[PDB]
Design a protein around this ligand. Structure first.
Ligand SMILES: CC(C)=CCC/C(C)=C/CC/C(C)=C/CSP(=O)(O)OP(=O)(O)O
Ligand SMILES: CC(C)=CCC/C(C)=C/CC/C(C)=C/CSP(=O)(O)OP(=O)(O)O
Lengths: 228, 228
């Protein structure tokens, strides 16, 4: 049963640049080392009864990072979709990418579509990777779905309430986010899951994403259990 | 100039029940003592160049608190609109109430409307009191404004983007929220300004709202200045 009653954990995976800079290295080196922490967090979540794990992997504002940092990132995503997918599948993990995927390269989009298809029937941990994601953008997509319904004459503007918009934001089919963890030291949620984090516990740690391990994750969970 | 470059501070005024319970008293006693901290925070903000101060005074979920706690609260609001309004006016503070005011009693609504009218032309601190407010509700009101436009044939569903919804959420005429402070010990934003806090620094303190003073406020500001 969910470690300390926590059903859905979302993580802002920050501090990779800081971690690499402390060792005289570039951001891209830290992002690669960040992929190992992703593996450890996914394994920990799947082994501790967590229902969904949602990871902030690429904000819609990160397009403005250096071109080479961005390309290295895209190649890291492709690489992960090639290397870990069989394993997610064997572990009964259902993979979903949330965010505006229409802006990624062809090969990246085809791989996302196939990996999600392959694991769509899995019933264990749902792993959501937020890529080219923004919380405001997420809300706007639901708003457009409803505006279209207003267009078609199938919905009256006065019928729109919170629950109806809630059924049109990302991850509405999953348990609500209970805990948001941000590594790296900064205390902002940076446009991550705005609608969905309305009642979530927020946990900030100076631990840098590439160093985040099982004891750190257990620690964030215990802060949650003592969410008294 | 804004204390340490902070233009807009929003506060979740919590810990009043805990503060009163520690002394063997009921929540209502803590909420009354909370009114003194409101005075101190408003004075501090107006004297330190802050452009807007937004205070969470009554969540839309607080209707479920004990009837007598709720009534005492309504009477505390009326009382404040009667006692502090002249002073806000003399201090060049512009008062705004955000939230669903249609659900308050007649006398409370008339007083809100007159106090806002009286200070509408003031040019110093804008003080927003979030009463019967919810962040999701706030977003839905903007969504209805746009859905109506879609109805009237004056807007196409594909023209709706973040900036357009941003012009229809509360406080869109003010500087964006830079710092959210929550007193009381809990680490949740509890449906407060979801859309607006996308890039805000979040500061949690175990200090209880009735004890929050100028040194505590200066402290939250310095954490912000070191928002590095
Ligand atoms: C999903 C997968 C297979 C791997 C995940 C790889 C990682 C860790 C991705 C996050 C990349 C970015 C752009 C993080 C932003 S903060 P930053 O760390 O770039 O810089 P900061 O140190 O916080 O200032
Ligand atoms: C605007 C004005 C004139 C005065 C403000 C008066 C105050 C402090 C209002 C907030 C009241 C409520 C319902 C706070 C909720 S948490 P809680 O403190 O009720 O309980 P908690 O201790 O956090 O568990």
């Amino acid at each position: 049963l969910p470690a300390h009653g926590c059903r859905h954990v979302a993580i802002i995976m920050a501090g990779n640049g800081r971690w690499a800079k402390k060792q005289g290295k570039i951001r891209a080196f830290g992002h690669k080392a960040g992929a190992k922490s992703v593996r450890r967090a996914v394994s920990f979540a799947a082994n501790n009864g967590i229902e969904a794990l949602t990871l902030y992997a690429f904000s819609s504002e990160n397009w403005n990072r250096p071109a080479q940092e961005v390309s290295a990132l895209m190649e890291l995503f492709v690489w992960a979709l090639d290397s870990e997918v069989k394993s997610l599948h064997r572990h009964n993990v259902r993979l979903r990418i949330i965010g505006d995927t229409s802006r990624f390269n062809s090969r990246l989009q085809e791989r996302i579509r196939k990996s999600e298809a392959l694991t769509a029937g899995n019933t264990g941990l749902t792993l959501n990777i937020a890529a080219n994601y923004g919380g405001r953008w997420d809300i706007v997509q639901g708003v457009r779905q409803l505006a279209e319904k207003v267009q078609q004459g199938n919905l009256q503007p006065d019928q729109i309430d919170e629950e109806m918009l809630n059924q049109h934001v990302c991850m509405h089919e999953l348990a609500p986010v209970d805990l948001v963890i941000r590594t790296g030291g900064e205390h902002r949620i940076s446009n991550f899951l705005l609608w969905q984090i309305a009642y979530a516990e927020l946990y900030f740690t100076d631990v840098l994403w590439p160093d985040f391990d099982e004891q750190d994750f257990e620690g964030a969970l215990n802060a949650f259990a003592n969410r008294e």
